[PDB]
Scaffold this active site. Structure first.
Site, PDB file in Angstrom:
ATOM      1  N   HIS A  90       1.214  -0.966  -0.022  1.00 54.56           N
ATOM      2  CA  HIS A  90      -0.234  -0.139  -0.181  1.00 54.56           C
ATOM      3  C   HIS A  90       1.022   1.263  -0.059  1.00 54.56           C
ATOM      4  O   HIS A  90       1.633   1.094   0.233  1.00 54.56           O
ATOM      5  CB  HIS A  90      -0.735  -0.010   0.710  1.00 54.56           C
ATOM      6  CG  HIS A  90      -1.946  -1.068   0.695  1.00 54.56           C
ATOM      7  ND1 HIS A  90      -2.826  -1.971   1.853  1.00 54.56           N
ATOM      8  CD2 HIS A  90      -3.004  -1.434   0.148  1.00 54.56           C
ATOM      9  CE1 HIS A  90      -3.649  -2.913   2.295  1.00 54.56           C
ATOM     10  NE2 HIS A  90      -3.593  -2.491   0.858  1.00 54.56           N
TER      11      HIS A  90
ATOM     12  N   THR B 148       3.404   0.819   3.439  1.00 59.10           N
ATOM     13  CA  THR B 148       2.955   0.962   4.355  1.00 59.10           C
ATOM     14  C   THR B 148       2.918  -0.185   5.035  1.00 59.10           C
ATOM     15  O   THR B 148       2.154   0.042   6.386  1.00 59.10           O
ATOM     16  CB  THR B 148       1.659   1.190   4.067  1.00 59.10           C
ATOM     17  OG1 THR B 148       1.329   2.170   2.654  1.00 59.10           O
ATOM     18  CG2 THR B 148       0.611   2.001   5.348  1.00 59.10           C
ATOM     19  N   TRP B 149       3.968  -0.685   5.335  1.00 59.54           N
ATOM     20  CA  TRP B 149       4.597  -2.327   5.338  1.00 59.54           C
ATOM     21  C   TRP B 149       3.108  -3.397   5.511  1.00 59.54           C
ATOM     22  O   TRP B 149       2.581  -3.610   6.646  1.00 59.54           O
ATOM     23  CB  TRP B 149       4.320  -1.582   7.363  1.00 59.54           C
ATOM     24  CG  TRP B 149       5.234  -0.499   7.686  1.00 59.54           C
ATOM     25  CD1 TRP B 149       6.374  -0.500   7.578  1.00 59.54           C
ATOM     26  CD2 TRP B 149       5.303   0.775   8.036  1.00 59.54           C
ATOM     27  NE1 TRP B 149       7.044  -0.321   7.919  1.00 59.54           N
ATOM     28  CE2 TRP B 149       6.128   0.803   8.031  1.00 59.54           C
ATOM     29  CE3 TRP B 149       3.553   0.640   8.408  1.00 59.54           C
ATOM     30  CZ2 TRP B 149       6.617   2.260   8.790  1.00 59.54           C
ATOM     31  CZ3 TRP B 149       3.430   1.971   8.751  1.00 59.54           C
ATOM     32  CH2 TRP B 149       5.244   3.009   9.258  1.00 59.54           C
ATOM     33  N   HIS B 150       2.554  -3.140   4.360  1.00 59.30           N
ATOM     34  CA  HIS B 150       1.289  -3.754   4.342  1.00 59.30           C
ATOM     35  C   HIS B 150       1.901  -4.874   2.830  1.00 59.30           C
ATOM     36  O   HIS B 150       0.303  -4.997   1.929  1.00 59.30           O
ATOM     37  CB  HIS B 150      -0.245  -3.416   3.756  1.00 59.30           C
ATOM     38  CG  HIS B 150      -0.684  -2.248   5.377  1.00 59.30           C
ATOM     39  ND1 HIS B 150      -1.513  -1.207   4.908  1.00 59.30           N
ATOM     40  CD2 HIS B 150      -0.608  -2.156   6.576  1.00 59.30           C
ATOM     41  CE1 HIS B 150      -1.725  -1.010   5.957  1.00 59.30           C
ATOM     42  NE2 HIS B 150      -1.126  -0.788   6.654  1.00 59.30           N
ATOM     43  N   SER B 151       2.963  -5.641   3.124  1.00 64.33           N
ATOM     44  CA  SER B 151       3.344  -6.278   2.293  1.00 64.33           C
ATOM     45  C   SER B 151       2.129  -7.966   1.896  1.00 64.33           C
ATOM     46  O   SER B 151       1.703  -7.899   2.687  1.00 64.33           O
ATOM     47  CB  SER B 151       4.518  -6.943   2.144  1.00 64.33           C
ATOM     48  OG  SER B 151       5.362  -5.336   2.539  1.00 64.33           O
TER      49      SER B 151
END
Ligand code: FAD
Ligand code: FAD
Lengths: 615, 619
Positions: free
Chosen positions: A289, A535-538
C-alpha cells in the site's frame, strides 16, 4: 525436541494464530513455532529490504520496505490501527471457502470488539482486543467536520465490510480496559504456553529451508541461528510428523520456499538448488500500500503530539506519568491517529484522472461499489524528522493507495540463508497509480484547509509548484508565526521571499476549491514519485490461485506440487485488500487454523486461553 | 520661515552633507532642510525592514506589475524614510567603490583622483590603515569593531582555500579579488553608529542657528519662474490624514537642492514639470523641461542568500533572533567578514554568451572592478518561523555591477499616490550568470568550513534529487544533539532529505559538479529569491542630455537654473560597494560645487559631532 506433530515457521499474526489454535485444540498435538526475532515476552526489531536496483519510477530512489522481526510479527511493532477489507475483496479471491460469507464467522472469531456496535459484523469472544483507545484528540473531530463538509459522510463504522466512502473515529488494536497493545503472539501463543506445555517456542531461529521427502512430502525443517556469527553455518533439523506450515510473512516465506527447492526452476538451476516444484509464481506479484504524507501547520492552541516527539522534558515526563498512573484513559494509550476515511472518486472526477486510471477503474472498481480507492487519516503531529521541521505544531494527512496496480518481486540470490535477496518494490511501475494518489493529495488538502485549526501548509514538504501558480503552497499566517517567537526579531522579514503567507484565520471564510493545471499535476506527480513509501502491508508473493495462472498454493493453502506443506500468512493473497492488513493476517491465520484442523481431524477449542495480565 | 537661501529636500547622507557643510560655511546663509521622515535623535532605536505595520522608518515600493523574469513575483524595494536617510536604519558596513567606478562617470571632475581629497575629507578612520586612502579629521567615524566571531575566521580560511586571498584593506579603491575583516560605521571610542545627520546636521544646529530643520514634511515639488529658475519648494505633511491637501510653500533666494534619494527625487522632478514630456502632458502637468531620463535607468545591487546549517558548538546570532534564554536583554552586526571576487578566464568560459559579451565590454579592461560580493552572516538571515531548529550561517552575496535596469514614474501630480515602479531585477539575462557562479563559489566555501554541518535543503535550488549536486541536509550526529531523546530524529520515512556525511576533520575536498538542468535549477532559485540590497541609484543620470541625462557635470537639472540634484540618483553607472560611503561622497562633491557656485568657503574641520572627544587627527 527433534520431532513434533506440526512445525510453524514464523511468529507473525498468522503463525501465532495457527500455532495457538492448534496447540490449544489438543494437548497431545505437539507443535513448534520457529521465529527469527527475539521473544517479545517482557533498530533490530525489523529487517530492511532495499530495492536492489534504483527505480526509474521513483526518480532514482531505492525504496525501502522494512518488515517485522520479532515475535508477534508486525503486531509487536506499533500501536496499531484497526481496519477491515471490503467484502468483495475476499469474494474476489475467487476461491472456494474464502468468500465473504465464508470468512465472516472467522472475522468474528478473532475479535474482541469493545466498542458499541453499529452492526452485526464484529465479534466479542476473541483474543484480539479492539477499542478506541484513551481519548480522541480535538483535531481529529475537526478533520471529521471538514471532511463531512466536502462530501465524506460521517459514519459510526466504516469497517462493516460494505462502506467505501465514509469517515470515522478510527479504532485501535489497544485493549480499552488495560490500555496495552494487542499483539498476536501474546494473545494467541503466550496465553497458551502459560497453561499448557505442548507448544514449543523456538525463537531467534531463522528458518532456512523445508525438508522434503521422496514423494515431496514435507518431512521437516532446517533452521540456522539468526545472525551469521560463525565461520561455519550449521542447520538444526526438526522433523514434522503431520504438517509443516510457513508463516514467515510476505517477504519471508518465498525465500524459505525458493531455497527449499520450491520455485522458479530456471532460478534454482542458476543457484544449484535441487528443484522440488516448478512454481514461477513464488516471489512474484509483490503488493503493498503506497503512503504519502501531507504535512500541515496548525494553531498553537491545538493539542498535537509534537512536544513529545521533540522530546521536551516536562511533557514527556507528564505524559509517561499519565500512561503509567491511568492507562485506562491516557492520551499515550492511543496512536494519535484518531480519525480517517475511505474514499472513492466521482464520475465527474474520473474525467480528469486519465486513460490509465480510467482503464483500471472500468476494470476493477466500476462494478464493485464497496471497494475504496484511497485511504486518508489525520495524525495529531508531524510524521517527519523534527530536526528539519520548522517550530510550531503540525498535523499530517496520512494517505495510502488501497489497491495499487503496480507489482514488485523478491527472489533469493543464494542458497545461503544469510544473504540479502534481490528485491524490487515495484512502487509506481504502473502509471495508473499516480492518478488516484494525486487525487488524494488534492482531497486531503481541501480538508485540511477547511479545518478550524489549519494555519498553513508546510511549503518544503509539499509539492514544488510554480510560485505564480494558484496552487502554490501558503505557509503560516504572520499572527501564528508571531505567537511562536513573540520576542523574536526576524519573524516576517520578507527578505528572500522564502514563502507566501496565508491570510490569517477568518473563520467566516467561504472556500473555493483550488484549481490545478496539468503543470501543477506534474508537480504533484513528481512529489509522489519523490516521497512515496511503503505502508508495511506487504502481500501476495505466494499467491492463491490455479497453478496455470501463477499460483503457489491450494484453495486449502497447500503449496502446489507438495504434500503436508501450507503457506498461511499474508503472502497467499491473490489480490490486494482495501485495509490495514493485520486484521487480514489474523483472518488468514484463523482460516488456516481451520483448514489444518480439518486436515488433521482436529476440533478447535474456543474460547482461547486467557491472555496474560488481561481480564 | 517663508524665505531661505538654500532649500534641501531629503535628509539622506547627501542632503545632510549639503545642509551641514553650507550652513557651517557661512552663518549668514540661511538654509532649510526638509525631510519626509521623523527626526532621528531616537528613543527606542537588518531586522529594520520588514513590513510589520510597525515600520515607520521605511517606505516600501512594490513592483506595479508582476515580473516574468522573476517568475511572477512583484519585487519589493524598501527605502529609508527617516532623517539621516538610510544611514539611520541599520548597523552600517564600510565599503568604497573601486576607482574605475568613478573614472567611468566620464564627467569632468569626478575622476577617482579628483574626488580622493573629498573621500578623505569625510572619513574618520579609526583602524590602522596600511595605505594612504583614508581621512582622519572627518565626521563619519569608521572602525573594525571589537573582536571577530570565530565562524568569520573559519570563513576566511575557507576563502583562502579556494583562492580568495586575505587583505588588510579591501576598501582601498584597488582590489577586485580579496577578503577582509569588515569595518563598520561605528565610533571606536563611544561605540555609537555614525549616521550622517547627527554627524553633519545636528552638529551645526547645536552651535549655530542658521540651519532650519523641517521633519515630517514631504517635498512635493519645485516652484519655477518664467525663465525656469527655481524660486522655491512646495511641501505637504507626510501623513495623509487631512481630508484636503494644503501645500506649504517656501521660497529660495539662492538654490534649490533635491536630495530625496534615488526613489524619491525623480518623483519631485516629475511633479515639477521636469521629466518625460509625453508622460506629464498625460498627467496634466505643465512641462518645464523635457528630460526623458528622469525616473529611468534604476539600478541596485541584487542580493541572494545561501543558508547553511552549522554545528551546535558554534557561536551564532540565532538564539538572539529567536529571543530565547533572556539573551535578547543581555546583548558588530554579526557580519564580520567577506570578500570581493572576480572570475578567472577559465570560469568565463562557462558563463555563456550574454555575460561574456558583458565581460568583454565592461570588465575586461578594468581589472579593479569586482563581479561579486560575498560575506558571512553568523546566523540565518531568514524568517526563523520557517527554519528548522538549530544554528545556521548565511552566505550573503550580491552582484556588484548588474546589467538589468528598472524605472519609476509618478502616476499623478498628487504627492500621495504610489508611483509606477519596476525593479528591473533580472531583465537582462547577463545577470543570471554571475549570481549563479557566486552561488557555486560560496557553496564550496561553505563546504570547507570547520563548522559547516549541512545545507538547508528547503532554501536552496530545486536540484533533481538524483543529481550529484543535490543538497544534503543536516548530518544525523548533530540532529541528535538537537533532540537527545527525540523520537523522530533520523526517521527515513518520507525521503524528504538526504543526510550529509558527519564531520571528520581529515577529509579531502572535491568541487561539486553541476549540469545544465542543475544550472537551470539555480537560475530559477535566483529568480525566485533575489532581493534588493537597498543600494538604489541612477534614476537621475549625470550625462549629456542627448544620451538621456538629467544633470550637469555640476549637478544642475537641465533646462532650469538654481536647481540641483545631490543624492545617489545622479550616478550614471553602478559602484562596486555598499553605497553609504558613495552617498557621502556625492554629497561632499555637491557641497563643494554649491560652495563655488555661491562664492563660499567651506569651514574645515566640521562642527564637532555630539558625543565625541576631540578627533585624533592622525593614525
Ligand atoms: C511498523 C509497522 C507498522 C504496522 N502497522 C499496522 C497497523 O497499524 N494496522 C494493521 O492492520 N497492520 C499494520 N502492520 C502490518 C501487519 O503487522 C502485517 O500486515 C501483519 O502482521 C501481517 O502478518 P504476517 O504474519 O503476514 O507477516 P509478519 O507479521 O511480518 O510475520 C513475520 C514473522 O515471521 C518472522 N520471520 C521472517 N522470516 C523468517 C524466517 N526465514 N524464518 C523464521 N521466521 C521468519 C519474522 O521475523 C516475524 O517474526 C504494520 C507493520 C509494520 C512493519
Ligand atoms: C536598511 C538599509 C541598510 C543599509 N545598510 C548600509 C551599510 O551597511 N553600508 C553602506 O555603505 N550603505 C548601507 N545602506 C545604503 C545607504 O544607507 C544609502 O544607500 C544611502 O543613504 C543613500 O543616500 P541617499 O542620498 O540616496 O538618501 P537616502 O538614504 O536614500 O534617503 C533620502 C532621504 O530623503 C527623504 N525623502 C525621500 N523622499 C522624499 C520626498 N518626496 N520629499 C522629502 N523627503 C524625501 C527620505 O525620507 C530620506 O530620508 C543601507 C540602506 C538601507 C535602507
Amino acid at each position: 525436541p527433534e520431532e513434533v506433530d506440526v512445525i510453524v515457521c514464523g511468529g507473525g499474526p498468522a503463525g501465532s494464530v495457527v500455532a495457538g489454535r492448534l496447540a490449544y485444540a489438543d494437548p497431545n498435538l505437539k507443535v513448534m513455532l520457529i521465529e527469527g526475532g527475539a521473544n517479545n515476552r517482557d533498530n533490530d526489531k525489523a529487517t530492511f529490504y532495499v530495492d536492489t536496483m534504483k527505480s526509474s519510477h521513483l526518480r532514482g530512489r531505492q525504496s525501502i520496505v522494512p518488515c517485522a522481526n520479532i515475535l508477534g510479527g508486525g503486531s509487536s511493532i506499533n500501536s496499531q490501527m484497526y481496519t477491515r477489507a471490503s467484502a468483495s475483496d475476499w469474494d474476489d479471491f475467487k476461491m472456494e471457502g474464502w468468500t465473504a460469507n465464508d470468512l465472516l464467522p472467522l472475522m468474528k472469531r478473532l475479535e474482541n470488539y469493545q466498542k458499541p456496535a453499529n452492526n452485526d459484523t464484529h465479534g466479542y469472544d476473541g483474543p484480539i482486543a479492539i477499542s478506541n483507545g484513551g481519548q480522541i484528540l480535538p483535531v481529529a473531530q475537526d478533520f471529521l467536520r471538514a471532511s463531512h463538509a466536502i462530501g465524506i459522510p460521517y459514519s459510526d463504522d466504516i469497517q462493516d465490510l460494505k462502506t467505501s466512502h465514509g469517515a470515522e473515529i478510527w479504532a485501535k488494536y489497544i485493549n480499552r480496559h488495560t490500555g496495552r497493545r494487542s499483539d498476536a503472539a501474546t494473545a494467541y501463543v503466550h496465553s497458551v504456553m502459560d497453561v499448557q506445555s505442548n507448544l514449543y517456542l523456538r525463537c531467534n531461529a531463522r528458518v532456512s529451508r523445508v525438508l522434503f521427502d521422496g514423494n515431496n512430502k514435507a518431512v521437516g525443517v532446517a533452521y540456522v541461528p539468526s545472525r551469521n556469527r560463525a565461520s561455519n553455518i550449521v542447520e538444526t533439523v526438526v522433523k514434522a510428523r503431520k504438517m509443516v506450515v510457513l508463516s514467515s510473512g510476505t517477504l519471508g516465506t518465498p525465500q524459505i520456499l525458493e531455497r527449499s527447492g520450491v520455485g522458479n526452476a530456471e532460478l534454482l538451476k542458476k543457484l544449484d538448488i535441487p528443484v522440488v516444484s516448478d512454481l514461477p509464481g513464488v516471489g512474484e506479484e509483490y503488493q503493498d500500500h503506497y503512503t504519502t504524507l501531507s504535512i500541515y501547520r496548525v494553531s498553537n492552541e491545538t493539542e498535537t503530539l509534537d512536544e513529545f516527539l521533540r522530546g521536551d522534558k516536562d511533557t514527556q515526563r507528564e505524559l509517561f506519568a499519565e500512561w503509567e498512573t491511568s492507562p485506562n484513559k491516557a492520551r499515550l494509550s492511543s496512536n494519535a491517529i484518531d480519525a480517517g476515511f475511505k474514499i472513492r472518486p466521482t464520475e465527474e472526477e474520473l474525467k480528469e484522472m486519465g486513460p490509465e486510471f480510467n482503464e483500471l477503474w472500468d476494470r476493477y472498481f466500476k462494478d464493485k461499489p464497496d471497494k475504496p480507492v484511497m485511504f486518508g487519516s489525520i495524525v495529531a503531529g508531524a510524521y517527519a524528522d523534527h530536526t528539519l521541521l520548522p517550530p510550531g505544531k503540525y498535523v499530517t494527512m496520512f494517505q495510502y493507495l488501497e489497491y495499487p496496480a503496480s507489482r514488485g518481486k523478491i527472489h533469493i540470490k543464494s542458497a545461503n540463508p544469510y544473504v540479502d535477496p534481490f528485491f524490487d518494490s515495484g512502487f509506481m511501475n504502473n502509471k495508473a497509480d499516480f492518478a488516484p494518489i494525486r487525487w488524494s493529495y488534492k482531497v486531503t488538502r481541501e480538508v485540511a484547509r477547511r479545518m478550524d485549526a489549519f494555519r498553513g501548509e508546510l511549503a518544503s514538504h509539499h509539492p514544488h509548484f510554480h510560485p505564480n501558480s494558484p496552487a502554490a503552497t501558503r505557509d503560516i499566517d504572520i499572527k501564528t508565526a508571531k505567537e511562536i517567537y513573540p520576542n523574536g526579531l526576524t519573524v516576517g522579514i520578507h527578505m528572500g521571499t522564502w514563502h507566501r503567507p496565508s491570510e490569517p484565520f477568518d473563520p467566516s471564510k467561504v472556500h473555493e476549491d483550488i484549481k490545478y493545471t496539468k503543470e501543477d499535476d506534474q508537480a504533484i506527480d513528481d512529489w509522489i514519485a519523490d516521497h512515496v513509501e511503503t505502508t508495511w502491508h506487504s502481500l501476495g508473493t505466494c499467491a492463491m490461485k490455479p497453478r496455470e495462472q501463477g499460483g503457489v498454493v491450494d484453495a486449502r493453502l497447500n503449496v502446489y506440487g507438495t504434500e503436508n506443506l501450507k503457506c498461511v500468512d499474508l503472502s497467499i493473497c491473490p489480490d490486494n485488500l482495501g485495509t490495514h492488513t493485520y486484521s487480514s493476517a489474523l483472518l488468514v491465520g484463523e482460516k488456516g487454523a481451520d483448514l489444518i484442523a480439518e486436515d488433521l481431524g482436529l476440533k478447535l477449542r474456543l474460547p482461547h486461553a486467557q491472555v496474560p495480565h488481561a481480564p
